[PDB]
Coordinates of C-alpha atoms in Angstrom, one line a residue:
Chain A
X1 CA 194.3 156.6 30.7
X2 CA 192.7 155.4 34.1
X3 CA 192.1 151.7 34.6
X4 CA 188.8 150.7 36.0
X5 CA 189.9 149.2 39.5
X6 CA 189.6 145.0 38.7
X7 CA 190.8 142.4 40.8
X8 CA 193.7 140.5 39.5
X9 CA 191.9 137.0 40.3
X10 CA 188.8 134.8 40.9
X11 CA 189.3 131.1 41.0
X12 CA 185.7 129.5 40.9
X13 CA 184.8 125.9 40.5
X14 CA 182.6 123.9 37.9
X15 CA 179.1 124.4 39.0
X16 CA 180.1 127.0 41.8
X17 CA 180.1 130.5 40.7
X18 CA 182.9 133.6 40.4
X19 CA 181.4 137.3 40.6
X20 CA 184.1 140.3 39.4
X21 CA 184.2 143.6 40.2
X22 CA 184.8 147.0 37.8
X23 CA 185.4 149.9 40.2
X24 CA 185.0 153.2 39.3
X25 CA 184.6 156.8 39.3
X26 CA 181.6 159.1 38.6
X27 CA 182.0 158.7 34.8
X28 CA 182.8 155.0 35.0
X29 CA 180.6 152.9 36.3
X30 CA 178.9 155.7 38.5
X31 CA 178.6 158.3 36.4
X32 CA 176.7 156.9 33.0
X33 CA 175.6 153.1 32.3
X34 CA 177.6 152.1 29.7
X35 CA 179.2 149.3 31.6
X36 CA 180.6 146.4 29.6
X37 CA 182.3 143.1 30.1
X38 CA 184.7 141.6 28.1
X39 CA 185.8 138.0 27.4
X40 CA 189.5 137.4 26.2
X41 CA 191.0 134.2 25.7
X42 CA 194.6 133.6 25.5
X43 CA 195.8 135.1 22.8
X44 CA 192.4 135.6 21.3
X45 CA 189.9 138.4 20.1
X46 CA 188.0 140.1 22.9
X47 CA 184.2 138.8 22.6
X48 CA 181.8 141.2 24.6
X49 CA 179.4 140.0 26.5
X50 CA 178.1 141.9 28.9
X51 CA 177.1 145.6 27.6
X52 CA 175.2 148.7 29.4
X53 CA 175.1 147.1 32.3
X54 CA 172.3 144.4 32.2
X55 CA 172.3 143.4 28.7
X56 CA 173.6 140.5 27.0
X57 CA 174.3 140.1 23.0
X58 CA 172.7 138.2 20.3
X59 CA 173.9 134.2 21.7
X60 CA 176.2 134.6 25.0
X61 CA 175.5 132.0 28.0
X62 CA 173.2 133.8 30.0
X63 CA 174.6 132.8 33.2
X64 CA 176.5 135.7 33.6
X65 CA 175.3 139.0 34.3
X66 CA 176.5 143.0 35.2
X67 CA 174.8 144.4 38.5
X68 CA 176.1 147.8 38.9
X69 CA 175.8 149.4 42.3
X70 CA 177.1 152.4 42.1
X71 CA 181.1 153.7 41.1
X72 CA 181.3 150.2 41.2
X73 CA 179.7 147.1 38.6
X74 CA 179.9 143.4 38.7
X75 CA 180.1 140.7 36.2
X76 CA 178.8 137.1 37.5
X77 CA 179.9 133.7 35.8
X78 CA 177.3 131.3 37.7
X79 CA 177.8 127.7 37.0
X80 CA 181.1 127.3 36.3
X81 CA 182.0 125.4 32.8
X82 CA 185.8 125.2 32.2
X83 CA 185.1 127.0 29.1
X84 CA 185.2 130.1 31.3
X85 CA 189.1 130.5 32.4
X86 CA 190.1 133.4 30.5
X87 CA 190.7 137.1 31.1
X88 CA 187.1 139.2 31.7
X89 CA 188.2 142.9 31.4
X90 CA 185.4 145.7 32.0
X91 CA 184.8 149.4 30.5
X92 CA 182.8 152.6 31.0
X93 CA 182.1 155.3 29.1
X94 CA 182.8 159.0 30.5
X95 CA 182.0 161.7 28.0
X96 CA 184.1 162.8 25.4
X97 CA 183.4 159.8 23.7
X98 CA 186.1 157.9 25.2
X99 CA 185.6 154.8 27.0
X100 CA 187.9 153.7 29.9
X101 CA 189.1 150.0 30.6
X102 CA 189.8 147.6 33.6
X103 CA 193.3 146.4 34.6
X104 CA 191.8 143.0 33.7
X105 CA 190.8 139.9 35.5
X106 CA 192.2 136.4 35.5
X107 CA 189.1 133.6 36.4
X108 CA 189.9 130.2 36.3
X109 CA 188.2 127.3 37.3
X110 CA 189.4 124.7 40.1
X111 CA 188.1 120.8 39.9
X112 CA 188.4 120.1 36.2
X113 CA 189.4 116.6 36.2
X114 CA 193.1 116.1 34.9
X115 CA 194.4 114.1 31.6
X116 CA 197.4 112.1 30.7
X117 CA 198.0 113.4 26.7
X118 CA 197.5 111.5 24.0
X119 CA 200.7 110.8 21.8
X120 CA 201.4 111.2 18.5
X121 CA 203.9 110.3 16.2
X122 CA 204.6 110.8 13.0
X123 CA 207.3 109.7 10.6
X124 CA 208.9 112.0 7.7
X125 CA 206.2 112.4 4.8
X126 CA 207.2 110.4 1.7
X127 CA 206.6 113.8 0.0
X128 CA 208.8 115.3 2.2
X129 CA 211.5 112.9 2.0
X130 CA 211.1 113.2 -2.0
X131 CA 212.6 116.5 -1.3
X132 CA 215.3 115.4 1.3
X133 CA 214.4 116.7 4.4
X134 CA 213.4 114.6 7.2
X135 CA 211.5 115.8 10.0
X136 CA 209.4 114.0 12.6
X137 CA 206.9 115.5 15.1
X138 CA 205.6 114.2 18.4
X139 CA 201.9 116.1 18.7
X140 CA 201.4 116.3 22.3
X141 CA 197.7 116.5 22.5
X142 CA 195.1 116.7 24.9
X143 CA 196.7 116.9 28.6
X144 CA 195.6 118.5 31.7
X145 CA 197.1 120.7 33.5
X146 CA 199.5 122.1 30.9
X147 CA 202.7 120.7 32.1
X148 CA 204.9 118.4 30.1
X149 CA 208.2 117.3 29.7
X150 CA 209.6 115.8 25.8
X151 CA 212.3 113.8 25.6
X152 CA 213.4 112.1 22.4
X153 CA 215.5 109.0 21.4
X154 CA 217.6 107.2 18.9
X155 CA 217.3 103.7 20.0
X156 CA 218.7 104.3 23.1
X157 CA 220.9 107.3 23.8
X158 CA 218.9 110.1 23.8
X159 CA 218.4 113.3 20.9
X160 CA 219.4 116.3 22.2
X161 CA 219.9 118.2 18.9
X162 CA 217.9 119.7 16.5
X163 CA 214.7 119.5 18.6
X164 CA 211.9 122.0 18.8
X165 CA 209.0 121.4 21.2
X166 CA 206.2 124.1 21.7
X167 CA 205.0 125.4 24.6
X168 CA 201.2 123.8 25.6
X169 CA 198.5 126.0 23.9
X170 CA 194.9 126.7 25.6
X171 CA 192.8 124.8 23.1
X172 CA 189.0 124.3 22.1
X173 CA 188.6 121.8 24.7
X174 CA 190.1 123.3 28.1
X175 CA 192.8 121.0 27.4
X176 CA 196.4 121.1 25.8
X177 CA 198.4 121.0 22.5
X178 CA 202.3 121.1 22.1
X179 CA 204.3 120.3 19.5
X180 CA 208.0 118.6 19.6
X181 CA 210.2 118.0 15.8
X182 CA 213.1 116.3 15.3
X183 CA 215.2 117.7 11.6
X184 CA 216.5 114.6 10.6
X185 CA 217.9 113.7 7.3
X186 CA 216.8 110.6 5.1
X187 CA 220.7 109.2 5.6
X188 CA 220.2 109.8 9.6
X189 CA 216.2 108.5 9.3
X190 CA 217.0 105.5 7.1
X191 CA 220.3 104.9 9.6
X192 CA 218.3 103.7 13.1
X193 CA 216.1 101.0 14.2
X194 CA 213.4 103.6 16.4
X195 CA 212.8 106.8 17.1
X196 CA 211.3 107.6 20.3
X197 CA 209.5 110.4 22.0
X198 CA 209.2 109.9 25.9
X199 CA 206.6 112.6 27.4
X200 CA 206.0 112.9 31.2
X201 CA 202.9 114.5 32.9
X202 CA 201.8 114.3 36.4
X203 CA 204.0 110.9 37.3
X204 CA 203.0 109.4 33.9
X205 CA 205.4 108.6 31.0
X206 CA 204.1 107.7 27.4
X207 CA 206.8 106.9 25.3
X208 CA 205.8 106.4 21.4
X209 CA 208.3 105.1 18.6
X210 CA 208.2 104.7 15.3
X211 CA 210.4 102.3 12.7
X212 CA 211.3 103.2 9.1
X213 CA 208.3 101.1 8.0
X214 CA 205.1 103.3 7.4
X215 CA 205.6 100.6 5.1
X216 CA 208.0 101.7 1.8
Chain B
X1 CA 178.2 138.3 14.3
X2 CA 181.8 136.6 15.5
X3 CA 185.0 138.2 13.2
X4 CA 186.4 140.3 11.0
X5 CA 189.5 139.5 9.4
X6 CA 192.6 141.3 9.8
X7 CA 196.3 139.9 8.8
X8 CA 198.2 138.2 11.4
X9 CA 201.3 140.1 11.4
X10 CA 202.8 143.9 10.9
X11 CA 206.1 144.5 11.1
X12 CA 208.3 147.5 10.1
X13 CA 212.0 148.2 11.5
X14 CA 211.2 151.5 14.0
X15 CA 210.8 154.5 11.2
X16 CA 209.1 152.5 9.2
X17 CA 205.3 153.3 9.1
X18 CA 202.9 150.1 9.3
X19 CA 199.6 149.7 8.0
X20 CA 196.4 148.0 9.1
X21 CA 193.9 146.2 7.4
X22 CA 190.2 145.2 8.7
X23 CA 188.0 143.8 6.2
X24 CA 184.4 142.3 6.5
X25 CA 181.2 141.8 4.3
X26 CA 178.2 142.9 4.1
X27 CA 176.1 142.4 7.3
X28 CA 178.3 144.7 9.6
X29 CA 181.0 146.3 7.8
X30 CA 180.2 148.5 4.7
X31 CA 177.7 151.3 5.3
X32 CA 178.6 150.7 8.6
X33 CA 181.0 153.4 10.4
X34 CA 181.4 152.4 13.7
X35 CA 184.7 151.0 13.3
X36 CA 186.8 151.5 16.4
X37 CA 190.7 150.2 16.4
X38 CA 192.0 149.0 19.9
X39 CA 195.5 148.7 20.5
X40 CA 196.7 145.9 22.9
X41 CA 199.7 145.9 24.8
X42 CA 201.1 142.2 26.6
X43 CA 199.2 141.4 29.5
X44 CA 196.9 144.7 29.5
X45 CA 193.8 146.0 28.2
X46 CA 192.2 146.4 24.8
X47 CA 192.9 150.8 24.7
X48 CA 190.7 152.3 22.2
X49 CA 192.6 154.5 19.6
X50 CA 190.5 155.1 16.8
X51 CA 187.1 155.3 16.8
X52 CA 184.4 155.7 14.8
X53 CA 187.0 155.7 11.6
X54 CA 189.4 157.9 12.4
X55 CA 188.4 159.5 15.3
X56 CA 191.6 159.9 17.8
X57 CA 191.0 160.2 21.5
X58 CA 194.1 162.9 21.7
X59 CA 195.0 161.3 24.8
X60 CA 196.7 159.8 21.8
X61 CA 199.7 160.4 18.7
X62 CA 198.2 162.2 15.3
X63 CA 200.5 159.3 13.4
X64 CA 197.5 156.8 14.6
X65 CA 195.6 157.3 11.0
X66 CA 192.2 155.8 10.3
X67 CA 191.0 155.0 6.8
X68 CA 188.2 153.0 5.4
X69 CA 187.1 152.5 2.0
X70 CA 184.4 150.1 0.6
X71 CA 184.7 147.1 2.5
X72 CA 188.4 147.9 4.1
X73 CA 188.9 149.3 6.6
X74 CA 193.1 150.6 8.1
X75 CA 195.2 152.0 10.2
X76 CA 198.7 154.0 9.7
X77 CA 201.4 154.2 12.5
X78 CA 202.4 157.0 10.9
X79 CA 206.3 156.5 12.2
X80 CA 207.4 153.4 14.1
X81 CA 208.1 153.7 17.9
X82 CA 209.3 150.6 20.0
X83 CA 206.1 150.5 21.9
X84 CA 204.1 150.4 19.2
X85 CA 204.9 147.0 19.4
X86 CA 201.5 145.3 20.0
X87 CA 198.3 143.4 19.1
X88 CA 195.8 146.0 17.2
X89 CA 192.3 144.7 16.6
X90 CA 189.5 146.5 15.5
X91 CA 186.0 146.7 16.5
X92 CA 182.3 147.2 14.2
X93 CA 178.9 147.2 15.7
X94 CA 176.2 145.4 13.9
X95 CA 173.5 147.7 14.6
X96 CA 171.9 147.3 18.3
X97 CA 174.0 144.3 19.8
X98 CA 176.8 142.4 17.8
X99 CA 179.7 144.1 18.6
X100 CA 181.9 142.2 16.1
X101 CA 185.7 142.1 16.6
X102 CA 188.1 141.6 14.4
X103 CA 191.2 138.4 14.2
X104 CA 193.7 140.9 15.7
X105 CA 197.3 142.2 13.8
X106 CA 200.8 141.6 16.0
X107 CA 202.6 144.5 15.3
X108 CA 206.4 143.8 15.5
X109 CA 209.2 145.9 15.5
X110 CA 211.9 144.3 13.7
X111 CA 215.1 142.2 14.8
X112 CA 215.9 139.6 13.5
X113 CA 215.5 139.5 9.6
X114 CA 211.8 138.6 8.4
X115 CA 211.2 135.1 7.7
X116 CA 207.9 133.6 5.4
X117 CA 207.1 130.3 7.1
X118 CA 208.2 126.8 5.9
X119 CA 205.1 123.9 6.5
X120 CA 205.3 120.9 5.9
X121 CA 202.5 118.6 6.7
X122 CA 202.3 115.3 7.9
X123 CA 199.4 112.4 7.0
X124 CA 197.9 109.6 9.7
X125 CA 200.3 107.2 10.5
X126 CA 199.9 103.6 9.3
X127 CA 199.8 102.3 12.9
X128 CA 197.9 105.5 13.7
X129 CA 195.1 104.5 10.7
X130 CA 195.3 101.2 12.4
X131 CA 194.4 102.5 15.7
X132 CA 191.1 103.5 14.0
X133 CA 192.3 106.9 15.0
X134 CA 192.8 109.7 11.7
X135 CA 195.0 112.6 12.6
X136 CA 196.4 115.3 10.6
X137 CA 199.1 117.8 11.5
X138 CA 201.0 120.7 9.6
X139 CA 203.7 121.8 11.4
X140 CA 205.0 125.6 10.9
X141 CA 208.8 127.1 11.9
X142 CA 211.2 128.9 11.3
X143 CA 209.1 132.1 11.2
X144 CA 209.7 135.5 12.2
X145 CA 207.5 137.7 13.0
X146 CA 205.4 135.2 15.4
X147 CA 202.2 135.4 13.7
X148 CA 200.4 133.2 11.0
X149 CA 196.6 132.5 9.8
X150 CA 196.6 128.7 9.6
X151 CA 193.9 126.9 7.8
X152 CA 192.4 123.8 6.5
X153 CA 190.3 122.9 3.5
X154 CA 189.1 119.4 2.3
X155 CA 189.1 119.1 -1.3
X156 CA 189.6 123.0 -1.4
X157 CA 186.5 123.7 0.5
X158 CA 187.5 124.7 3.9
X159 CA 187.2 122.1 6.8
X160 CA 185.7 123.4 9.7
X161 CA 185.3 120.8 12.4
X162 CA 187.9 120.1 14.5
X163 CA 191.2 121.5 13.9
X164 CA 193.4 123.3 16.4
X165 CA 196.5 125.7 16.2
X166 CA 198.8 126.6 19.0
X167 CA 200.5 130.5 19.3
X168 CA 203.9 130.7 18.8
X169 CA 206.8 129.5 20.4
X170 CA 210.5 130.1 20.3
X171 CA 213.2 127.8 19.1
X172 CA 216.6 127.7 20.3
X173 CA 216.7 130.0 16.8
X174 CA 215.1 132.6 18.2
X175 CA 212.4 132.0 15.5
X176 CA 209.1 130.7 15.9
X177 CA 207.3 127.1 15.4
X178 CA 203.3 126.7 15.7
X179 CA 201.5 123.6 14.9
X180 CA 198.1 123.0 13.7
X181 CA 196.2 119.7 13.9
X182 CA 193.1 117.6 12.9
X183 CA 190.6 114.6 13.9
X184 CA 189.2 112.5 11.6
X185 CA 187.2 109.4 11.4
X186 CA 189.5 107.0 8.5
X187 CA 186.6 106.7 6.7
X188 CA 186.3 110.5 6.1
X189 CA 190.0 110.4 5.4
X190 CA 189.5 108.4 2.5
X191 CA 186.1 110.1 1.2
X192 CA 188.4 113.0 -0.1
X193 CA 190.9 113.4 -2.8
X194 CA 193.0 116.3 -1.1
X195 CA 193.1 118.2 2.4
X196 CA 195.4 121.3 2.1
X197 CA 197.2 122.9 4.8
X198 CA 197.4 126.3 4.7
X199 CA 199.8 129.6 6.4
X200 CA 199.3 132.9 5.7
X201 CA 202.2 135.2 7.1
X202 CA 202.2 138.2 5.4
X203 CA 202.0 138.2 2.0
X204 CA 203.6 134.8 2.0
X205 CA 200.6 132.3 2.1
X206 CA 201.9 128.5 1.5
X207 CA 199.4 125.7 0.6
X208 CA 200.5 121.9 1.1
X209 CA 198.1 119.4 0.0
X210 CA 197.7 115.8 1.2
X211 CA 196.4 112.9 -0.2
X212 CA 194.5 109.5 1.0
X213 CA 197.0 106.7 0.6
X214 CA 196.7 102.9 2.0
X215 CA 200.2 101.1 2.8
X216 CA 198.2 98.2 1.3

């Protein structure tokens, strides 16, 4: 093993610019030109990018770009788009036919303009209920930053049981998703006026309900 | 260029040997022997440990195997270790610059018992459809090992645009709940007969199917 010396950072901002360093050893970086960059996404496949050095594959943004110096290379995001917060990691080649990696890099983007999510929710399918279950989901979508807080309600004295929210996921947009349920049965759905969910972000509640009354 | 697929989730007690898979089609992986395997360990880099097939970088355990027939592509641990525990993807180079990854496998050493996924899948709201909004969302718990392949197909044909997945979360069950949405114009709600939701999680695949509906 021997992990490419990156720094653990570079916050950039949109239309700004963030440039990343691979340092090596004669082998890496130094040694041969088989430099490549990397671009991993939360819990995603890798996506390269940036290979030997200058070049750039068959559709990536060319706004980024390799400029080894020496032992040491760089990768540089110009321009910043929010798309680009994930985790750039680098590699050399140095004989043998192994290849050596990074430590890894987290770039993120400051000034993306923040957003109350958008609240969803659903009553037990009629499908569902056929079979005598009764669950209920409060999709969380589209907030900024990833934050939030679910809280849900029987007309009143708040549910507390039986409740399974999600933490936010990173997601298409560079924007949010969580997911809150709510096992009911059909007795306990059919045996209340509302059901609540009550979701706080930066200051701002949203608070959605639904009646027994999809229609019947 | 983009992905090959690989299934979402290995799992074997500690012992137990786990295979593998990496299939493609045509353009890239067939009479194309590049394959590399990476293995993947929380938050630190992609570590080659296969190449070119079945190459082993010694650096490394003989119980890594590499195997590929036709289209197929694998990988043995030969005899489970705790820290095999990991995200394995594998890598194929379509000839001078698209080096395609693959969807990634979560290798999971076993505790609690295995657990196939239970979805069930909820239509647009009435309000909701009134809101000229149309949103879709199949919810997934109750799963262990925390990985699925979630999926969405209009009238069988997959549905591409605009659906989004979260990872995994824990419930107070120590098993996991992802949820997987959709956006719709109404009209394109009703200009279909079905939409299916649809979880793979090894060997367990489970297909709901909803249907266009109007209260009134």
């Amino acid at each position: 093993p021997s992990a490419l010396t990156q720094p653990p950072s570079a916050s950039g901002s949109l239309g700004q610019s963030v440039t990343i360093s691979c340092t090596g050893t004669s082998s890496d970086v130094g040694g041969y030109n088989y430099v490549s960059w990397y671009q991993q996404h939360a819990g995603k496949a890798p996506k390269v990018i940036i290979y030997e050095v200058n070049k750039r594959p068959s559709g990536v943004p060319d706004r980024f770009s390799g400029s080894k110096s020496g032992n040491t290379a760089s990768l540089t995001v110009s321009g910043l788009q929010a798309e680009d917060e994930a985790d750039y990691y680098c590699s050399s080649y140095e004989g043998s036919d192994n290849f050596v990696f990074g430590t890894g890099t987290k770039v993120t983007v400051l000034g993306q303009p923040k957003a109350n999510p958008t609240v969803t929710l659903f009553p037990p399918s009629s499908e569902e209920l056929q079979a005598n279950k009764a669950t209920l989901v409060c999709l969380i979508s589209d907030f900024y930053p990833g934050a939030v807080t679910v809280a849900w309600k029987a007309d009143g004295s708040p549910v507390k049981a039986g409740v399974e929210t999600t933490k936010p996921s990173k997601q298409s947009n560079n924007k949010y998703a969580a997911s809150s349920y709510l096992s009911l049965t059909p007795e306990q759905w059919k045996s209340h006026r509302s059901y609540s969910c009550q979701v706080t972000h930066e200051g701002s509640t949203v608070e959605k309900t639904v009646a027994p009354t999809e229609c019947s």
